[PDB]
Design a protein around this ligand. Structure first.
Ligand SMILES: N[C@@H](CCS)C(=O)O
Ligand SMILES: [K+]
Ligand SMILES: [K+]
Ligand SMILES: [Y+3]
Ligand SMILES: [Zn+2]
Ligand SMILES: [Zn+2]
Lengths: 557, 549
């Protein structure tokens, strides 16, 4: 069993060849059973197929365990056979492989995350954890999550795997349709940006499409990650012959694409549905011995939900309204667990032009940890947009970052060591970006004092390798309370000039009659100084219409 | 007959003494007739009073003609005696004066301007012109307009006198109450700012108050004009020669050029003036400089954002345009008062298809609104004839809406403003409407040279030229231009509503106004009835620490 350092070393030296399909091979041998059941019922057939790929030149084979998790096996009455199904698979693959690499293969459960299905993050996590435990015990050289269709389920899988073993090489794949989107709406850039920063070793694509159609999708993925890359196309577009779906792309037509994947930085090439030992033999000849190509990723500041990637290259409206402060009806409905009221609020803000939603749960001691976990997982699917997680308890913060389906914005660390460190460390583990609020030991009054917090923040962020994952909040103070908003505008201009995104808690300025007018005037002024987002009320039609006018006037849209 | 050059040369050299009262004095000889009638009925007594002042030390005497204009004499059945009253007065004063100066004295008519009374500017102008002609014919060394209470009437007086003669030394006075206001509301700074730029030689104050009470009022006047200054306080009449004459040094110290007495003063007062004053060269001063426009009761300085109400403009307004064409005044008055109530500090006034409007209507509107709405006007007039009529009749210092950057147009509009008073909006376009910041800047730079050679660079606001968004308007280019002009020390304005003519026009107007203000925009022609725009305006100025709560 090789660890991820050894596998990464090997990959850095040469492009490796994976294996082909298993189901279609088993069928040609007269076995139409659920593939995973053959590990118990006909281990000889599984061994023969592995050996046919080893003899065809594969450097890596996948264990016969695509469907071997409790949640998937339960659908076939096999839940109680998880342990022997998986141990047998690994032993059988190791027997075939000798010195070649054996990767534990895990596919998705077929269950959609709540609220599309019934399953919460923690249930998927435990499901994947149990299979990974068996595989690591049995001595796999790596774990590959093949054919995932949803980012929250894949996030659970990779986090569970890494929890079991910090040492195992981990590969995460999504499968994309012809429009370049997963089942729940994720495009390759979103997949790459969300997963590049998790502690996986490689990203990749398999299934759904043939080698030609995967090319531009793979290219997009390759542009946004510097990690190892893997591809396993189906053997062309499926056709039906005598009422069965067949993947008819022949070895040469398939193999001729290898150079194009090599040019995009591929590290491991194999095949999915319809790929046979004949294909792999040719791939072995065509690939040969190649050192992988170097690439440099494109870097952007973006946050995501399953279906939406929001890049801060334009003014971002962050809806403030899911926040029960001074909202008696929302507060009461949150305390009891009303989800529908939160969903309606989320959807209305989006309808009015919010691109990200801030989500805050008032007095957090009064709120059900499970309600939080539920709403966090739910809103990105139903409202379509990413969230700004506005959470104070470090503990609830962890639960929310875990269950968050995409790459979130995390609403706020002040410039304080203990606080920045805990929050940077959670975001490093679970993914995400951070709003850094420019205050600490005291609330600053002047531009100069804010500048000092900015530079102090930059120091801390540089030392934690986190400078590229922050937006700064200069700290809007109430007008009535000597807020000195000119000092905030000066700060916006300054940070903006340094290349960093900014945001404000806009409504805090006018905490007054005619607040809509103070908020509107400040936002216009802030945008003219470079303000790149704001946490604000999208239901304020004066504010939103004057915002649109401002962007039009300034040639931003 | 000395000309204004000669009289100016003498004032440069020495502070001069005027004379005392005539009206209050003539009785003490047994004469209670209108003083002006004594020029015909008792010329010996008029001669005696003048001589007593000359002996007492007056360097200048006033002709006995304070009430001698047709409109005033008509109230006494004496209008047909104008010519002999004035000609005798001059001949008598000249006999008394010898080598000393004789100034033709003209007081106000006692008639209030319409709408406070019935009198139009034109009638006041004709009235004063007649009297000035007679005095200039008979050979006075200057003309002084004493005791005026209203700036429209005083404006008519000084323009009439200048039309008769460009050479006669002209002194314009107002009289102020204890609160430092003329009858129709003008304070000493407004007086100075409005009249300083007119072709007069001296400004001053007489009557209503004693020397003590006038002092802070006179000081305020001295701070806003560089022209010669005159004062004639009343005698308190309890104020004796000694008490009165001890104030002279404080007036000297404020740059007084001629010191005299009004009601209640006597030859004995003048004797003491001469003893106390002696022979002094006048002090030099340099006035405070401000950019301001005015109405009779309101001076608006461009040291804060100035809202200029756009609404008196019939374009796209069917009912307002009907009414203008049938000479409706009440409709315009209503539009004026509402805009001011909503926060307009200046009102733009435009007459649409000008050829279709009665000039007498424009003249009447132009004179009326500053009195009833209280605020200055931006005169928004294309027709050069109508422009003259409006500027001539405007009660105060107006803003004139719009010269383009064109040698011929600027010269002709600059000259009208030089003659009638006023400030100018210079619109940054010429043969072709610009698109870029760079074009607008070139237009600005040209405009500045033209203005520089006509010595008008300080009486201008620049309009960078707001183009419609729906017509490739590039508002960013206008914003860059505002910033550049402000960086150069000049005021700016825009026709704000031109940007958004689009639905949700209020939101485009609002966004642009905020952004322009952030770049230094000094004013805007805009709709003060747009509550969103006005509330967001107040918010902007608060946030930027330019004002309010
Ligand atoms: N010159 C006039 C002034 C009256 S206010 C007079 O001495 O009677
Ligand atoms: K494979
Ligand atoms: K006198
Ligand atoms: Y072929
Ligand atoms: Zn496949
Ligand atoms: Zn008097």
């Amino acid at each position: 069993m090789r660890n991820r350092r050894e596998v990464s070393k090997l990959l850095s030296e040469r492009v490796l060849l994976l294996d082909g399909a298993y189901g279609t091979e088993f069928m040609k041998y007269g076995y139409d059973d659920l593939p995973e059941e053959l590990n118990i019922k006909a281990p000889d057939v599984v061994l023969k197929v592995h050996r046919s790929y080893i003899e065809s030149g594969s450097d890596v084979i996948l264990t016969n365990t695509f469907g071997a998790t409790r949640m998937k096996l339960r659908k076939h009455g096999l839940e109680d056979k998880l342990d022997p199904i998986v141990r047998n698979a690994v032993r059988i693959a190791r027997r075939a492989a000798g010195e070649k690499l054996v990767f534990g293969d895990i596919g998705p459960t077929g269950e959609l995350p709540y609220p599309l299905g019934s399953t919460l993050f923690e249930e998927f996590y435990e499901n994947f954890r149990e299979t990974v435990e068996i595989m690591v015990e049995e001595g796999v050289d790596g774990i590959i999550f093949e054919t995932f269709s949803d980012i929250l389920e894949l996030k659970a899988a990779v986090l569970a795997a890494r929890e079991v073993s910090r040492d195992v090489f981990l590969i995460a794949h999504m499968t994309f349709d012809e429009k370049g989107r997963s089942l729940t709406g994720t495009d390759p850039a979103n997949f790459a940006i969300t997963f590049d920063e998790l502690d996986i070793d490689a990203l990749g694509i398999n299934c759904s499409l043939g080698p030609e159609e995967i090319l531009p999708i793979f290219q997009e993925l390759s542009q946004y990650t510097d990690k190892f890359l893997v591809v396993e196309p189906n053997a062309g577009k499926p056709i039906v012959e005598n009422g069965k779906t067949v993947y008819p792309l022949k070895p040469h037509d398939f193999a001729v694409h290898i150079d194009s994947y090599y040019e995009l930085g591929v590290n491991i090439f194999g095949g999915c549905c319809g790929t046979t030992p004949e294909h792999v033999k040719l791939f072995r000849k065509v690939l040969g011995n190649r050192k992988p190509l170097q690439r440099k990723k494109k870097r952007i500041f973006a946050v995501s939900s399953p279906s939406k990637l929001v890049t801060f290259d334009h003014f971002v409206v962050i809806g403030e309204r899911i926040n029960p402060a001074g909202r008696k009806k929302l507060w009461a409905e949150m305390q009891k667990g009303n989800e529908e009221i939160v969903i309606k609020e989320a959807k209305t803000q989006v309808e009015k032009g919010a691109e990200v939603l801030d989500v805050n749960f008032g007095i957090e001691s009064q709120i059900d940890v499970r309600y939080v976990e539920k709403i966090v997982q739910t809103l990105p699917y139903v409202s379509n947009v990413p969230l700004s997680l506005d959470i104070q308890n470090v503990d609830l913060t962890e639960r929310a970052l875990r269950a968050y389906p995409g790459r979130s914005l995390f609403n706020s660390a002040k410039v304080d060591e203990e606080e920045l460190e805990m929050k940077i460390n959670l975001l490093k583990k679970y993914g995400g970006t951070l709003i850094v609020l420019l205050m600490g030991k005291d609330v600053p009054k002047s531009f100069e004092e804010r500048k000092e917090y900015f530079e102090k923040a930059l120091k801390i962020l540089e030392r934690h390798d986190f400078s590229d994952r922050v937006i700064f909040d200069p700290g809007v103070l109430p007008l009535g309370a000597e807020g000195k908003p000119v000092e905030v505008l000066k700060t916006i201009e300054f940070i903006s000039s340094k290349g960093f995104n900014t945001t404000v808690g806009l409504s805090n300025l006018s905490f007054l009659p005619d607040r809509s007018y103070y908020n509107t005037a400040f936002l216009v002024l802030g945008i003219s100084k470079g303000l790149s987002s704001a946490i604000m009320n999208p239901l304020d039609e004066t504010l939103m219409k004057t915002l649109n006018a401002t962007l039009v006037i300034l040639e931003k849209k």
